[PDB]
Design an enzyme around this catalytic site. Structure first.
Site, PDB file in Angstrom:
ATOM      1  CG  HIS A   1      -0.486   0.452   2.667  1.00 40.03           C
ATOM      2  ND1 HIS A   1      -0.137  -0.348   3.638  1.00 40.03           N
ATOM      3  CD2 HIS A   1      -0.213   1.621   2.791  1.00 40.03           C
ATOM      4  CE1 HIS A   1       0.279   0.237   4.465  1.00 40.03           C
ATOM      5  NE2 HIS A   1       0.267   1.529   4.163  1.00 40.03           N
TER       6      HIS A   1
ATOM      7  CG  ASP B   1       0.069  -3.663   2.770  1.00 37.33           C
ATOM      8  OD1 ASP B   1       0.239  -3.324   1.775  1.00 37.33           O
ATOM      9  OD2 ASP B   1      -0.375  -3.137   3.886  1.00 37.33           O
TER      10      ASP B   1
ATOM     11  N   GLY C   1       3.410   6.464   9.178  1.00 38.07           N
ATOM     12  CA  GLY C   1       4.570   6.739   8.974  1.00 38.07           C
ATOM     13  C   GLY C   1       5.407   5.470   8.897  1.00 38.07           C
TER      14      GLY C   1
ATOM     15  CB  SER D   1       2.771   1.613   6.483  1.00 33.10           C
ATOM     16  OG  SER D   1       1.786   1.931   7.269  1.00 33.10           O
ATOM     17  N   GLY D   2       5.194  -0.287   6.122  1.00 39.75           N
ATOM     18  CA  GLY D   2       6.280  -0.669   5.024  1.00 39.75           C
ATOM     19  C   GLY D   2       7.270  -1.385   6.030  1.00 39.75           C
TER      20      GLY D   2
HETATM   21  C1  LIG Z   1       1.321   3.617   7.402  1.00 39.40           C
HETATM   22  O1  LIG Z   1       1.933   4.565   8.746  1.00 39.40           O
HETATM   23  C2  LIG Z   1       0.516   2.288   8.099  1.00 39.40           C
HETATM   24  C3  LIG Z   1       0.727   2.234   9.615  1.00 39.40           C
HETATM   25  C4  LIG Z   1       0.305   0.761  10.131  1.00 39.40           C
HETATM   26  C5  LIG Z   1      -0.421   0.421  11.401  1.00 39.40           C
HETATM   27  C6  LIG Z   1      -1.078   1.858  12.279  1.00 39.40           C
HETATM   28  C7  LIG Z   1      -0.919   1.444  13.765  1.00 39.40           C
HETATM   29  N1  LIG Z   1      -0.209   0.072  13.852  1.00 39.40           N
HETATM   30  C8  LIG Z   1       0.433  -0.210  12.600  1.00 39.40           C
HETATM   31  N2  LIG Z   1      -0.895   2.505   8.032  1.00 39.40           N
HETATM   32  C9  LIG Z   1      -1.844   2.957   7.303  1.00 39.40           C
HETATM   33  O2  LIG Z   1      -3.035   2.053   7.703  1.00 39.40           O
HETATM   34  O3  LIG Z   1      -2.079   3.548   6.257  1.00 39.40           O
HETATM   35  C10 LIG Z   1      -3.462   3.512   5.682  1.00 39.40           C
HETATM   36  C11 LIG Z   1      -4.127   2.414   4.689  1.00 39.40           C
HETATM   37  C12 LIG Z   1      -3.963   1.173   4.628  1.00 39.40           C
HETATM   38  C13 LIG Z   1       1.105   4.336   6.523  1.00 39.40           C
HETATM   39  N3  LIG Z   1       1.740   5.722   6.333  1.00 39.40           N
HETATM   40  O4  LIG Z   1       1.213   6.151   5.171  1.00 39.40           O
HETATM   41  C14 LIG Z   1       0.298   5.340   4.853  1.00 39.40           C
HETATM   42  C15 LIG Z   1      -0.453   5.522   3.504  1.00 39.40           C
HETATM   43  C16 LIG Z   1       0.140   6.182   2.771  1.00 39.40           C
HETATM   44  C17 LIG Z   1       0.401   7.789   2.789  1.00 39.40           C
HETATM   45  C18 LIG Z   1       1.183   8.147   1.536  1.00 39.40           C
HETATM   46  C19 LIG Z   1       1.811   7.555   0.469  1.00 39.40           C
HETATM   47  C20 LIG Z   1       2.319   7.967  -0.518  1.00 39.40           C
HETATM   48  O5  LIG Z   1       2.886   8.976  -0.842  1.00 39.40           O
HETATM   49  N4  LIG Z   1       2.522   7.045  -1.493  1.00 39.40           N
HETATM   50  C21 LIG Z   1       3.084   7.144  -3.006  1.00 39.40           C
HETATM   51  C22 LIG Z   1       4.583   6.423  -3.004  1.00 39.40           C
HETATM   52  C23 LIG Z   1       5.124   6.994  -4.300  1.00 39.40           C
HETATM   53  C24 LIG Z   1       6.451   6.720  -5.088  1.00 39.40           C
HETATM   54  C25 LIG Z   1       6.931   7.511  -5.997  1.00 39.40           C
HETATM   55  C26 LIG Z   1       5.792   8.645  -6.495  1.00 39.40           C
HETATM   56  C27 LIG Z   1       4.689   9.091  -5.638  1.00 39.40           C
HETATM   57  C28 LIG Z   1       4.290   7.998  -4.664  1.00 39.40           C
HETATM   58  C29 LIG Z   1       3.084   8.155  -3.745  1.00 39.40           C
HETATM   59  C30 LIG Z   1       1.425   6.020   0.574  1.00 39.40           C
HETATM   60  C31 LIG Z   1       0.797   5.516   1.613  1.00 39.40           C
HETATM   61  N5  LIG Z   1       0.103   4.117   5.591  1.00 39.40           N
END
Ligand SMILES: *[C@](=O)([C]([C][C][C]1[C][C][N][C]1)[N]C(=O)O[C][C]=[C])C1=NOC([C]C2=[C][C]=C(C(=O)[N][C]3[C]C4=[C][C]=[C][C]=C4[C]3)[C]=[C]2)=N1
Ligand SMILES: *[C@](=O)([C]([C][C][C]1[C][C][N][C]1)[N]C(=O)O[C][C]=[C])C1=NOC([C]C2=[C][C]=C(C(=O)[N][C]3[C]C4=[C][C]=[C][C]=C4[C]3)[C]=[C]2)=N1
Ligand SMILES: *[C@](=O)([C]([C][C][C]1[C][C][N][C]1)[N]C(=O)O[C][C]=[C])C1=NOC([C]C2=[C][C]=C(C(=O)[N][C]3[C]C4=[C][C]=[C][C]=C4[C]3)[C]=[C]2)=N1
Ligand SMILES: *[C@](=O)([C]([C][C][C]1[C][C][N][C]1)[N]C(=O)O[C][C]=[C])C1=NOC([C]C2=[C][C]=C(C(=O)[N][C]3[C]C4=[C][C]=[C][C]=C4[C]3)[C]=[C]2)=N1
Lengths: 243, 243, 243, 243
Positions: C44, C91, C192, C194-195
């Site tokens: 994700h 995921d 922050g 995640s991954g």
């Molecule tokens: C994560 O922090 C996770 C944390 C997981 C749990 C919370 C408490 N216990 C562990 N969780 C989360 O659930 O996210 C949402 C749904 C599934 C997290 N951080 O950020 C996200 C979501 C997210 C935000 C921003 C991006 C992003 O910018 N992505 C892309 C990557 C990229 C590469 C090149 C050019 C453009 C882009 C845009 C991605 C995901 N989840």
């Protein structure tokens, strides 16, 4: 700082960062070390309303904010009694540190200009800080200390500039006598730089001619930066700061 | 408006709303109709910088903001030449409509006071508008016009209160002579009300004592609201608005 | 990371930070180095929609974000084809660097677990990252890498708790089998992270048991954190990463 | 609602607005009156976690949101037990009002389609609501009820479109069987419309074909709006709502 560059690690050994207590000691204004135990800054950074010292700290010369923090407590905040708002004037204040700092080649005071000195319009001056790199846009991490060469301008021509495109009458002063202005549409200080120093090299020695105060936006047309004129408050500063 | 109640449909026939063009014609300030072709408001609402008239519109008394809009275009913006910042003073301005307004019992002008009117403490005064109901708390939809009774206090009494908890010297005037103060910790005007009227009934007639200008926050301790004193600027107003 | 402490420089040499191009190369997700040319992360974080590889870079272990950047370009983004949303599952994803990285004591790969490893409750594990320190609470500068020991609990125990206070029928499985569960109300990963990796020390060797995936908030009552179960996707990984 | 226009006050008499208790009863979702005492909506608007009825209210057909409010209490919230997230499916719920409403030409129920009805691709259908007029673009005041004509799309075709520009394997279902889809890059429903009705005129009569569920953004290329197929759950709905 608008239109500038990250400053060489050996430049501006007097630049200081003002911190306020919260989730973390965040930077809210700049300042300058004018004496081993005193920091010159802008009054609107710490007033007009009284502040709690316990919530204030001082950080000395730092290449990147927050990285090598060694916060210093403040024993006293002295805000000019004639200050209420930056547009009115007297935007200058002093911070007495709780301990004198051990000056080094990397961290020492800046020199105050003599009462007679008059930084001629056009003199090569520099302004430094961690303020925004442009209107509404913050300085990105790792937050390097920026600098920029801004050309000083005559008070009258500045006051004039501020009336262009404004309803304020021509004989009504906007840029007052206790202020000084510098910068253009490509070089200026910005939100986060206030309280910081405007130094000019004179004869072969750096003198603080101003303190980042206010202005309409950053680098905007006919709206150069306004700074508290240090020479104007030399006597008030010396009533507290030795020699 | 802080601490008031929704106003009845039959009151405040002179209240107006100033709108600026954007995603929709948004309310940014208040005003009052003092003549079929003129609106009185705060100078800081439309200045100190010159604005594109086309981007500005005026809305006559409305029970609920945006609900029944019939926006009116503006031909002239006249800002008091002595104005620059509200805290400095002369926070007054005039808007000339492109067409005269038809008056009725639901929509008519407000009476300006005689040059000698003082509005001493104990006088019955009210302030109205679509501003915030508290610091950082906007008026929720459907956005009703609110009103609140505010206690008027002598200028020197407010000036002294503004110096409490502040570094500004006691002899350095904060609340100026061309200003008027009213309100307390439960009744005050707030952001979004600027430019609107502060009216007091004097001998069966309503008179506009002042124009919502500024204050440190809203309904805060020792920080009563400040209004630009209409009687101080009658001569100016009459240089444009016929008797 | 919620409820942890700054990690020492000698720990988690496999941690990585994913960066998206913008005003600055911002951190949006964690990751782990499993090979000199490959990085493991959450699907994700880079999908389900295809991204412009050019706007993505990888930063190897850093004690503090943005301070010692040495960004590395990516040549391939491989997302498990079964992925669509984290709740549904699968995921997991792989990043192929354009050049292999030189391994050392401060930066090297993490060992993947054998297909039969279950990581039973009781057995302590740690999760690391630069995520929020609480719900809606960002990691403050200078952005240190944090670590926290999280209690692992059986999948069915977590599934049952996710149904507490919900309308979802008890027999409609929420915490799926390709998932793994850890953390409590004082220790958990957050936005922050995640991954990033969840590692457990088994026979004197560290094994990545999971990949930070999702959860309802962070460290919330009856809502332990959910991680992709690495052992479930070993075959897929080896379809790309050498053994 | 993206594209489309303000609806005539004689259209969509069954549309409703869901309000949650805060500074004011704020709209969080749309809905439809399918029975004098029942409102059909999207499960995610009120789930998965359990909600407090005391904080929920229903507003019947209003031309401009918030202006003529007559909030009706809710006695029961029935969320389909197979629901956990919109992408997984079963995004449908029922709201039992505490009192049957006195239907009229202006406000009355919409009718459910017969379990046989299929609504062929390229069918004239309309979706309505007070949601965003575009991605991250609020419906401005006075908040008129909007409507747009959107083309139904075959499920396979929608699933197919959602796979374009995505890493999800082609045989992995994204748009599921209990879902229905409609819209294009110019016409679509958006944030604020969820739980709302998708009606089509069949044999000269209005039937609700779907409930505004989810979608990747609004009116995005190859990302048509996804709705909960009503026919699919008629049996579940009829277990509570009288025939
Ligand atoms: C994560 O922090 C996770 C944390 C997981 C749990 C919370 C408490 N216990 C562990 N969780 C989360 O659930 O996210 C949402 C749904 C599934 C997290 N951080 O950020 C996200 C979501 C997210 C935000 C921003 C991006 C992003 O910018 N992505 C892309 C990557 C990229 C590469 C090149 C050019 C453009 C882009 C845009 C991605 C995901 N989840
Ligand atoms: C400055 O950046 C300047 C901008 C200077 C011009 C811009 C372009 N040309 C030059 N200030 C500015 O004053 O403009 C408008 C006013 C006249 C700046 N940044 O922020 C400010 C104002 C400000 C913000 C926040 C604080 C603060 O946090 N204050 C206190 C101090 C304190 C001590 C202990 C405990 C709590 C506190 C809170 C102060 C000032 N100016
Ligand atoms: C006001 O709400 C007031 C409230 C006054 C006191 C608070 C409690 N007691 C009374 N005061 C206030 O002083 O604000 C701060 C500065 C001194 C108020 N609201 O907003 C303002 C300032 C303001 C913000 C934004 C605009 C605006 O949008 N202006 C223009 C007008 C225009 C016309 C055509 C084309 C473009 C524009 C932009 C104006 C004023 N004061
Ligand atoms: C919807 O607008 C849908 C949009 C529909 C699509 C756009 C184009 N094609 C159709 N959007 C959506 O993102 O769906 C969900 C899955 C990813 C929408 N609006 O808002 C939401 C999400 C949402 C916001 C706010 C609430 C809320 O406040 N809920 C509750 C109800 C309640 C009652 C009492 C006390 C507390 C609460 C909190 C719920 C959902 N989706």
């Amino acid at each position: 700082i608008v239109g500038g560059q990250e400053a060489p690690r050996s430049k501006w050994p007097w630049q200081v960062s003002l911190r306020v207590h919260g989730p973390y000691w965040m930077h809210f204004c700049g300042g300058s070390l004018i004496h081993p135990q005193w920091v010159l800054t802008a009054a609107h950074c710490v007033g007009p309303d009284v502040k709690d010292l316990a919530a204030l700290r001082v950080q000395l010369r730092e290449q990147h904010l927050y990285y090598q923090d060694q916060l210093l407590p403040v024993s006293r905040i002295i805000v000019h009694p004639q200050f209420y708002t930056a547009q009115i004037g007297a935007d200058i204040a002093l911070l007495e540190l709780e301990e004198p700092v051990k000056v080094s080649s990397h961290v020492h005071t800046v020199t105050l200009p003599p009462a007679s000195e008059t930084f001629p319009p056009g003199m090569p001056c520099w302004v430094t800080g961690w303020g925004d790199v442009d209107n509404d846009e913050r300085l990105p991490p790792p937050f390097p200390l920026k600098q920029v060469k801004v050309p000083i301008m005559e008070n009258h021509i500045c006051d004039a500039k501020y009336h262009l495109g404004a309803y304020t009458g021509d004989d009504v002063r906007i840029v007052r006598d206790d202020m000084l202005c510098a910068g253009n549409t490509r070089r200026d200080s910005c939100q986060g730089d206030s309280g910081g120093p405007l130094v000019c090299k004179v004869n072969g020695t750096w003198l603080q001619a101003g303190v980042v105060s206010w202005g309409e936006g950053c680098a905007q047309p006919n709206r150069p930066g306004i700074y508290t004129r240090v020479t104007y408050y030399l006597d008030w500063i010396h009533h507290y700061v030795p020699k």
